[PDB]
Amino acid sequence: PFEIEVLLPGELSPAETSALQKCEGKIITFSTLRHRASLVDIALSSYYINGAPPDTLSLLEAYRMRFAAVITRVIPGKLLAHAIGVGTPTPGLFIQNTSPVDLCNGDYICLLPPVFGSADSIRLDSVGLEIVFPLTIPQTLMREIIAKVVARAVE
Amino acid sequence: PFEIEVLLPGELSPAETSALQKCEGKIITFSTLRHRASLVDIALSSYYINGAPPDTLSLLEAYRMRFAAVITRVIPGKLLAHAIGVGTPTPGLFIQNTSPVDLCNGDYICLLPPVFGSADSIRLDSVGLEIVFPLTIPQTLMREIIAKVVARAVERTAAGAQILPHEVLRGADVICYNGRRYELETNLQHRDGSDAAIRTLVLNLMFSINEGCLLLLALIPTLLVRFPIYETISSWISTSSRLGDTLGTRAILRVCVFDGPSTVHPGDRTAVIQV
Amino acid sequence: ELAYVRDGVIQFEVQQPMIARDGPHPVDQPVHNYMVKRIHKRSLSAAF
Question: Residue C37's beta-bridge partner residues?
Answer without folding.
Answer: C10
